[PDB]
Subunit: 365 residues, 3 copies
Amino acid sequence: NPFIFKSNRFQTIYENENGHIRLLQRFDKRSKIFENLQNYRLLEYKSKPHTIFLPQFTDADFILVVLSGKAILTVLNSNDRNSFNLERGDTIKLPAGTIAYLANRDDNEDLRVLDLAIPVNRPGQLQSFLLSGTQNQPSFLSGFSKNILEAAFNTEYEEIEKVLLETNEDVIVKVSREQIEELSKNAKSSSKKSVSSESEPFNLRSRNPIYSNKFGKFFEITPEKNPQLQDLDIFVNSVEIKEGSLLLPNYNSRAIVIVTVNEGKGDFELVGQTKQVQRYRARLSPGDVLVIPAGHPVAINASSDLNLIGFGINAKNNQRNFLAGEEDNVISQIQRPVKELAFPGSSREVDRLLTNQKQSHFANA
Amino acid sequence: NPFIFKSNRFQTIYENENGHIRLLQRFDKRSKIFENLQNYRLLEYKSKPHTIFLPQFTDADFILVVLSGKAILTVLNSNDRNSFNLERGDTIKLPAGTIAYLANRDDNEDLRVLDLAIPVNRPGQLQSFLLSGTQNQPSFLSGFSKNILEAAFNTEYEEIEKVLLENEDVIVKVSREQIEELSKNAKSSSKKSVSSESEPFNLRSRNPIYSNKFGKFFEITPEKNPQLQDLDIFVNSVEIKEGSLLLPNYNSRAIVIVTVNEGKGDFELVGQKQVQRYRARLSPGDVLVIPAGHPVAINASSDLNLIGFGINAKNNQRNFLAGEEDNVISQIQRPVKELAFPGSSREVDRLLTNQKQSHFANA
Amino acid sequence: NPFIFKSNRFQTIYENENGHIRLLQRFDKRSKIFENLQNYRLLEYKSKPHTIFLPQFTDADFILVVLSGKAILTVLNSNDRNSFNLERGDTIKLPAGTIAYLANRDDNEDLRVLDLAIPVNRPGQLQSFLLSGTQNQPSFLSGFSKNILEAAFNTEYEEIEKVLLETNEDVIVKVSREQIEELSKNAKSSSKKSVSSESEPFNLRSRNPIYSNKFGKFFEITPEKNPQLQDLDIFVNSVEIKEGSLLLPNYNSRAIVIVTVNEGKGDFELVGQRKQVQRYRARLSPGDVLVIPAGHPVAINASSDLNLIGFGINAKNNQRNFLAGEEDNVISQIQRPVKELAFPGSSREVDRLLTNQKQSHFANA
């Protein structure tokens, strides 16, 4: 079952007593089945109260989703600087080569952040450049020679070394409340007017769910609804399935969906594979990842309340077709004659069966 | 000669007494020369009168062109349906994962459809999902367990098995009455226009770009139809009469997948090292691939109907090397004719004026 | 050092006493760390006064920059022709399959033209088609048989052989003052506050340089400024560093830049990985090529006046961040408290050091 990437397929990149950065194994190294996702990496950021991920940039477009907690994200341009109070569900594009720092502004809650990384230099590779200084090396500024650094800052190497250059004091570091109220001054939040913003964080739940009943909530921000997603051609969704309910059988017309379990337990069934069909079932636990190719229909059972974040690749003109229920049921759109031909049952047998499930998108399981 | 694909090289995918589905061998498997075509597939559909291809969806955009016959193509979205009267020449973009069925509605004429497919999940791969399932291979819904199907459909498994899951399969006969039902409010290709966002459009509904007593060239481009912009593809119909030739020409940018719809002919394609001629005889079902800037000439030994699919169509320029209209050689300024050519400005201009015909001439 | 391509690495394609054509080796054949540049080739054309590169076309989009000299460029579509007076700095796009020919119209100066080619048929493969029937190099019209030739031109074969079909006489050939005077008539020139041309040539120096001071000029044309660069997502630039000056440490957010040394000598330091950071340092000489991957900081030191021509792949929304000097210094943007936490210096000592370099973009070395 290559569609399930268990939590254990994440590699720890950086860990200390303040936080970790985890990178999911290359999709296409798991299976050549996913060669179309070779240039799609996924990372978890997690950090304790009053911590900071020091100024970093990477050669990759990042789509951040705040899974849980409260953060300050500061994004640096050459000449400007902007910082945002992020919350659960705040989503933002950080373009390749943008210097960002991320602080857990909360006194108690951990901060968890999912990252879709879309590299720019080499398919599927992340090179990051640290301003800070580690034990495996100091600041990338160390890369320049003495003559370059002296010429460039107009300052003796001695002073630059003292002031700029020289593992709990590394990458993710403790930060004072004093330092956090200072970072958090004049920090814009997401709005409803921000669901469409070109540069600012937008919230998945800031617009109404595309599907909603007593059994679940599907939220989806598409390229149509937000420009940060236009060039990359990505949608981001939050699917909340209640305890003992299911996401009804459905396929994306063209989107390939990378689904991460934020929280809750559940299971999924995916139909794939001249040729016969084939079930792919697995239990889903927090931090597990499910890849759903286009046209491959899927159902998701929840045991506990189950919250999923999905990135859709090939978003523009995606149609999600359901196979049971009322709204968006592509089967009940087959005309009377073809229903009779398609299926062993009569048209009247099929039509009565399709009225049984009175719910749409989600139902009791 | 890696540019000719013989009918021979369309593997048969499904066959029964009501029709055929055949798939051209991947272009990149015939030759690494076609690396950039690795994500394009070609299918022929052939059904008998009073037949249907049963509802299925594929993980690939389809460009369908009716080579021969009359059809009701029905097209399903999640919450809506549209169906279409397809006549010869009719062309429509069937997006990936869109459930379609295709009915032969002629009493007498076989239905023949050409499909350029562009996969979405893997370079070159068609994963198709059939609701009807073919006796040995069952409905894609069988993939779900009794638990999921019971909860989903809110129905005991026994009824789901009897109604949805458990002659002939895939391509099956239909009645007069069922063609009537399918024909209800089925929409036709406009007769003056080719600019429809979703309705089928006919290759011959706008004047051919080139036209004389020797040939006709019809071409719909991304600039002329919105369904061809995202995929960046032109569709064309070239009609060369017995004993005429499509005059030597090359496309600036576009790689053309040319399929012999009807008739017999010859191509010469100029390739690469010093230049090499690539000659082959053309028969129906044969496919010719014309890389960008690769000059081609096509002679018809009988009335020839070619159907082209041009990859990288936006800003494509087709330059002719002989004749009056679109002769790029004639655009060379006088002094660079003296220089470029053994002959003089005057004898070059002279030689160039000898073919008064444009685009097509006598062979 | 993969980032440095010496003149050596140019293969000669054609050469007579009239001129040469030089094709740089495939960037991926030098190192796999350039696989994202696989479909980008680089060519130098040189030709003596009163010479002409004979009519031809290639299955590749060319972006032309006149490095040096004076030229008529004639461009053929199927039912017209447009011809251009080209000077130093004039850049133009020649779509694949477009017949051109290029005259050195000067009495004195050689013509030096740099071409970025983006193949359309196979990745990185250039197929060129020579109209020129001369001593050797037999016209591609020769590929057609006699039957098809005679029928197409409606002319007995012997006449076609004599007139069209069948050394300093072969690809670049001499042209008389008079044939240059003929070519020059209806030749149009690039504008001043040009840059906007849909099809005609535009001059790198026709709008003001983005960065400029006593130490250097940086001219840059982007898809936003010129639409010929829109669909290929390329920027073209001219960087003039004055003797004993440097281009300050800087990185491109997302552009991969192919930099040719037009004239002058200097050195570069590039900061990459192989992980920990490593310095990649090499001397620059005329005809040398530097590849700068995105987010990879570089500093360029000029020994003599140093004139560089660069092609930026992925130009749209590229941000160039400087690390020293007043303007475009991203490090300066770091909020006070993060300067404290990120660097061994106090926020105050760091702020002072960053003010020591008074110059922006280019400074004294």
